[PDB]
Design a protein around this ligand. Sequence first.
Ligand SMILES: *CC(=O)Nc1ccc(NC(=O)C*)cc1
Ligand SMILES: [Cl-]
Length: 87
Amino acid sequence: ETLVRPKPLLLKLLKSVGAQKDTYTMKEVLFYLGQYIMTKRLYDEKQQHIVYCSNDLLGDLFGVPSFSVKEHRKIYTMIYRNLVVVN
Ligand SMILES: *CC(=O)Nc1ccc(NC(=O)C*)cc1
Ligand SMILES: [Cl-]
């Protein structure tokens, strides 16, 4: 089970949904990303796999104004660049 420590911007995102520990599993990071999208209601109301993130923290993490949760490699790439693997 791979343990990770998020870099500062991702750690800020996690804190905004109450995740405040230093080390996470990958499952946890993606779980909290989902909670962030849900609780901020960032998804398109009709095409709910589309996530809008312009002018949000998440937009600075992805560097683009929207993404689909179907885009697993794009999500992988964002998460990987924003953490350090510790085991
Ligand atoms: C509803 C829907 O489209 N779900 C879905 C499930 C899995 C995946 N991707 C992979 O399994 C890699 C995309 C969409
Ligand atoms: Cl924001």
